[PDB]
Short mmCIF file of all heavy atoms in Angstrom, two decimals:
data_model
loop_
_atom_site.label_atom_id
_atom_site.label_comp_id
_atom_site.label_asym_id
_atom_site.label_seq_id
_atom_site.Cartn_x
_atom_site.Cartn_y
_atom_site.Cartn_z
N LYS A 520 -15.61 30.30 40.39
CA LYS A 520 -14.78 31.30 41.02
C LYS A 520 -13.91 30.69 42.12
O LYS A 520 -12.69 30.85 42.09
CB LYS A 520 -15.61 32.46 41.59
CG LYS A 520 -14.68 33.59 42.06
CD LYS A 520 -15.44 34.77 42.66
CE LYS A 520 -14.48 35.69 43.43
NZ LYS A 520 -14.45 35.42 44.92
N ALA A 521 -14.53 30.01 43.08
CA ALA A 521 -13.83 29.33 44.18
C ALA A 521 -12.73 28.35 43.70
O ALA A 521 -11.62 28.36 44.20
CB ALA A 521 -14.86 28.55 45.06
N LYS A 522 -13.06 27.52 42.71
CA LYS A 522 -12.10 26.53 42.20
C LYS A 522 -10.91 27.22 41.54
O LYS A 522 -9.76 26.78 41.72
CB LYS A 522 -12.79 25.58 41.23
CG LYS A 522 -13.69 24.59 41.92
CD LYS A 522 -14.57 23.88 40.94
CE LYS A 522 -15.55 22.97 41.64
NZ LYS A 522 -16.29 22.08 40.70
N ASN A 523 -11.18 28.31 40.82
CA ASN A 523 -10.13 29.10 40.17
C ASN A 523 -9.23 29.80 41.19
O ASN A 523 -8.01 29.77 41.05
CB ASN A 523 -10.70 30.12 39.15
CG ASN A 523 -11.22 29.46 37.87
OD1 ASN A 523 -11.13 28.23 37.69
ND2 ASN A 523 -11.81 30.27 36.99
N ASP A 524 -9.84 30.38 42.21
CA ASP A 524 -9.12 30.93 43.36
C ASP A 524 -8.20 29.85 43.96
O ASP A 524 -7.02 30.09 44.22
CB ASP A 524 -10.08 31.42 44.45
CG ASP A 524 -10.89 32.66 44.06
OD1 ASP A 524 -10.66 33.27 42.98
OD2 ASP A 524 -11.82 33.01 44.84
N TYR A 525 -8.77 28.66 44.18
CA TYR A 525 -8.04 27.52 44.76
C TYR A 525 -6.89 27.09 43.86
O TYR A 525 -5.80 26.76 44.34
CB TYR A 525 -8.98 26.34 45.01
CG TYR A 525 -8.47 25.45 46.13
CD1 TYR A 525 -8.86 25.69 47.45
CD2 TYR A 525 -7.56 24.42 45.88
CE1 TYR A 525 -8.36 24.90 48.51
CE2 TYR A 525 -7.06 23.63 46.91
CZ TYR A 525 -7.48 23.89 48.23
OH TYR A 525 -7.02 23.09 49.22
N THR A 526 -7.15 27.08 42.56
CA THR A 526 -6.10 26.75 41.59
C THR A 526 -4.91 27.70 41.68
O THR A 526 -3.77 27.25 41.77
CB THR A 526 -6.70 26.69 40.16
OG1 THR A 526 -7.51 25.50 40.05
CG2 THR A 526 -5.59 26.69 39.09
N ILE A 527 -5.21 28.99 41.64
CA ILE A 527 -4.20 30.04 41.74
C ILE A 527 -3.43 29.92 43.05
O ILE A 527 -2.19 29.97 43.04
CB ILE A 527 -4.82 31.41 41.55
CG1 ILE A 527 -5.27 31.59 40.08
CG2 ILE A 527 -3.79 32.51 41.90
CD1 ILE A 527 -6.34 32.72 39.86
N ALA A 528 -4.14 29.74 44.16
CA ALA A 528 -3.49 29.58 45.46
C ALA A 528 -2.56 28.35 45.48
O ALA A 528 -1.45 28.42 45.97
CB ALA A 528 -4.52 29.52 46.58
N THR A 529 -3.01 27.25 44.88
CA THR A 529 -2.24 26.00 44.93
C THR A 529 -0.98 26.14 44.07
O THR A 529 0.12 25.78 44.52
CB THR A 529 -3.14 24.80 44.50
OG1 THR A 529 -4.20 24.62 45.46
CG2 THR A 529 -2.34 23.50 44.38
N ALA A 530 -1.14 26.69 42.86
CA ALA A 530 -0.01 26.91 41.94
C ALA A 530 1.02 27.79 42.63
O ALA A 530 2.21 27.48 42.63
CB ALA A 530 -0.48 27.58 40.62
N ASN A 531 0.55 28.88 43.24
CA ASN A 531 1.48 29.80 43.89
C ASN A 531 2.23 29.13 45.03
O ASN A 531 3.46 29.31 45.20
CB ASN A 531 0.75 31.04 44.38
CG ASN A 531 0.44 32.03 43.25
OD1 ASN A 531 1.11 32.05 42.21
ND2 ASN A 531 -0.56 32.87 43.48
N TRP A 532 1.51 28.35 45.83
CA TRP A 532 2.13 27.68 46.99
C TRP A 532 3.23 26.70 46.60
O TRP A 532 4.27 26.65 47.26
CB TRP A 532 1.08 27.04 47.90
CG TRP A 532 1.61 26.72 49.26
CD1 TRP A 532 1.85 27.60 50.30
CD2 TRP A 532 2.02 25.43 49.73
NE1 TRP A 532 2.36 26.92 51.38
CE2 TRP A 532 2.48 25.59 51.07
CE3 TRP A 532 2.03 24.15 49.15
CZ2 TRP A 532 2.94 24.52 51.83
CZ3 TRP A 532 2.49 23.08 49.91
CH2 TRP A 532 2.93 23.28 51.25
#
Side-chain angles (χ1 to χ4, degrees):
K520 189 181 166 263
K522 287 168 185 189
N523 287 357
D524 292 353
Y525 207 90
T526 288
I527 290 160
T529 295
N531 282 336
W532 197 76

